[PDB]
Design a protein around this ligand. Structure first.
Ligand SMILES: Nc1nc(N)c2cc(CNc3cc(Cl)ccc3Cl)cnc2n1
Length: 186
């Protein structure tokens, strides 16, 4: 299995959702970036895995679920099977990561990817090892009810650029944003 990653878009006030929707109006090219980064595999014969909590799964528009061309894994202790259209279910992030090494997945998975929600980001972000964060900074405040965990810059280094990530300021629908990549290894 390849690298472990989180990907998020976050407002200036650290918001990532409001009632299960994005705090901001749809940013079509930001979503394209999220689809491209998560899908683009780093090996032959494999797909990337996406790991998300249950609320994040059901926040994705049905037309958009599962995320195509990726293996979709949902985290829940309440669910007893994967939701309709999903591929795998685990009780917890540690369990999911253990699964990727079982014979059923070992072969199949390139990059791993954590796409939310807040508690899943927090546990990944505080677990030892090699982890990258792909963070889109939406450069405005937006009313939110779910937030990205604090990024400890003692351990997460902001990279000066990264292949496939634009370094400049972007703007859609009057909202400026920028892409960042952070990396820790502890
Ligand atoms: N950078 C980044 N990182 C993530 N984890 C993202 C995840 C999503 C998934 N959420 C979502 C998707 C659609 Cl099209 C509409 C409604 C919602 Cl709530 C959307 N954009 C994301 N951007």
């Amino acid at each position: 299995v390849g690298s472990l990653n989180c990907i998020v878009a976050v407002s200036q006030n650290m918001g990532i959702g409001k009632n299960g929707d994005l705090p901001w109006p749809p940013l079509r090219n930001e979503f394209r970036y999220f689809q491209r980064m998560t899908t683009t595999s780093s090996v032959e014969g494999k797909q990337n895995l996406v790991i998300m909590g249950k609320k994040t799964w059901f926040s994705i528009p049905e037309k958009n679920r599962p995320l195509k061309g990726r293996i979709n894994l949902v985290l829940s202790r309440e669910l007893k099977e994967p939701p309709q259209g999903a591929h795998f279910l685990s009780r917890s992030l540690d369990d999911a990561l253990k699964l990727t090494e079982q014979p059923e997945l070992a072969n199949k998975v390139d990059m791993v990817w954590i796409v939310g929600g807040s508690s899943v980001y927090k546990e990944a972000m505080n677990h030892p090892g090699h982890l990258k964060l792909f963070v889109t900074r939406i450069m405005q405040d937006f009313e939110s009810d779910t937030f990205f965990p604090e990024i400890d810059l003692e351990k997460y280094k902001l990279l000066p650029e990264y292949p496939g990530v634009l370094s400049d300021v972007q703007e859609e629908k009057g909202i400026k944003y920028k892409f960042e990549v952070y990396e820790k290894n502890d």
